[PDB]
Design goal:
heterotetramer, A mainly beta, B mainly alpha, C little secondary structure, D mainly beta, A: mainly beta, Immunoglobulin-like, 2 domains, 5-stranded antiparallel beta sheet, 43% strand, elongated, D: mainly beta, 4-stranded antiparallel beta sheet, transport protein, hepatitis, HBV, tetrameric, Fab heavy chain from antibody IgG clone number YN9016
Chain lengths: 220, 302, 47, 213
Amino acid sequence: EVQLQESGAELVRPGTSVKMSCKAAGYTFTNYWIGWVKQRPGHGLEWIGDIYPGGGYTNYNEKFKGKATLTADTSSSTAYMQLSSLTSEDSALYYCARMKINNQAWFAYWGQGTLVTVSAAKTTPPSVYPLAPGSAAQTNSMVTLGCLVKGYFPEPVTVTWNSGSLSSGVHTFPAVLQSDLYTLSSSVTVPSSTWPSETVTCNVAHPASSTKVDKKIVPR
Amino acid sequence: NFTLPPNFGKRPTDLALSVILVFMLFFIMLSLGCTMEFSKIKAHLWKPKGLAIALVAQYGIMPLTAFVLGKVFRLKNIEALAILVCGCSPGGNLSNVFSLAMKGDMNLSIVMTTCSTFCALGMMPLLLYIYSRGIYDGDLKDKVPYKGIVISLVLVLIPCTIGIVLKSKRPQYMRYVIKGGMIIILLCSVAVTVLSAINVGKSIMFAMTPLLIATSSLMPFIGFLLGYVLSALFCLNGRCRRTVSMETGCQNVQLCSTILNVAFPPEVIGPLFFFPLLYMIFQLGEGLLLIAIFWCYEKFKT
Amino acid sequence: GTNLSVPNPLGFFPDHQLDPAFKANSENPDWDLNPHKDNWPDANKVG
Amino acid sequence: DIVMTQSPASLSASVGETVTITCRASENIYSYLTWYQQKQGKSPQLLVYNAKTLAEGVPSRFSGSGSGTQFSLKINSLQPEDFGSYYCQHHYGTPFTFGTGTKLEIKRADAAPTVSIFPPSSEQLTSGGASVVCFLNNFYPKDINVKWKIDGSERQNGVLNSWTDQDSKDSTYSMSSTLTLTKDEYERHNSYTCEATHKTSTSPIVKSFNRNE
């Protein structure tokens, strides 16, 4: 079974170079082209360039011609890409893919993908602010709460409610950067006459800073 | 509007045609190995006048006549590039058979063929670069086969040297092997004709056009005439003149076919995908006509 | 280069090659390695 | 350069329903187009190459047919295992443009958002900032518009929106819209309210909040 293995996630400040590897197994790797595809989460796919490990012949996209360098290293059978100068624009998910014919340009086997984040912000522990319903405090039939976290740079943040408990009606929204720092909010919905009687807490962990914050929501 | 047969490359008939062509090449080389000896090859190598004049004629006329023909007939850029690649190709091995048809000192013929192929693998990209200025600014220099040329040269030379050794060792197998080889050559030639007719079908009519036919008919005849004139100009021997003239006109169109297939998608080169075939049949017909003319002139002498 | 075909001196089609196991006539020929073929927009032009 | 465009940007269909997606090429490409299928959090997989032939290990229900500038990808019977973005690509040119995406999503009965608004936390104000978060949970059509009336008047300067993709246990959406304000500015406008409008109802539902109780 032909398999492509990527290096792993990278975090690099702007202006510095970075290189990623695509180790190939299950076939010769010497007589098949390898193509590199960059995909942004909010945009379409685009083709960076191609490399033939046997002879080192490479073709580059005109846009990526300046800032993409491809290397074979056939001895270890791991293709490389070099990103050269880096800017905040080129933070995306990078794929290594292999052709099937060497005559046509449709890729058949893809790697797991390498995530590259370009930003100058230093690691910062998140700040957690509880969210409580307004002064109305209407019981109704079902009550919703929230937990707002902001000011954390990396993205390992996981939010849980009462640890094991809940995890049924909770929602976590994707992190969005505002001032080079990321903010996300998590909401939990709880049946009425339960939250005021019994605490719900809010468990948030930041493995990058190795900081875990635990706090509970009290009525205002 | 050009269309190809639904399964052109992949078909049992095409596979059979390829095997028959391989057997043709092998048996032609084996039968041709009878008429040459090591000593004459060494003598021709030591005196490189004929070899050098043959290379000069081939590589200063064929690309030149291709470019002039394309400019004169105002051909399309793709057609001009196709005929230019055909001209830049080395002399084929059909020249050796044609020289055998005119009893033309086959030692010099095979020496010229081998040296022409070896010089081709080096200077074909150079001629392509210095002659394609104006059409297809693309590189077109990595598309020319390099290792395949050497492998083909060795695989051609092997049966010929086998026949030469079999000759020099013991003549007794000439009348037991040459006649059989000639018979298989004849049946395989008939098979090649019928198989090409079956495979091509009615798609050839697209290749039929007053310009491509004119260029592919003018090219081998102009090659033969210019080679004869240039070789006679240097006070070369008449046998050497005939073999040089017949070699300089023959071309290896298979290289052009592969190069054009590699460089461009099939849709770009659609109608002239059959140009190597047109060149091959026209050079074969003109060679046969020259054979008939030479034999009639010999009858006139007697 | 990207052309790995063994040319046949007698031949007029891309599949006429002096290679023992005739892959060029199979479903998956592998004698050419150029996926970046030039579309050449001005191919059908005269100067 | 050849530009590739896909007609339906988003498309919703239930399990077992035939559906087609259309691709359009800027120029003629002589059926040199291939279809890719990417699932959520997974690398794209080859689905159809040369616009007709089905790749190895693909279900037979997929079918593609087209040439020139119009291409299509019928799914025929629809199974839950295939639901994600679909992509195109051409081999004709050198740049190998990839075209935009086409997302397939589950279909369900329309639902109204459960809009909730929250004041900034007590300790949030002490730091020096004020954030007002308005939640919109469990609405199926994902094209709401959120309007912030600070005092009967809209403002979009500091509004940041986050969207949750369609869930698994349910098949609805969720959106969080947070409006950030500096201190000594949050207390000069008294009331706050986030407004949500949706296709499920003509009138926009209003959730309000007064700073001084």
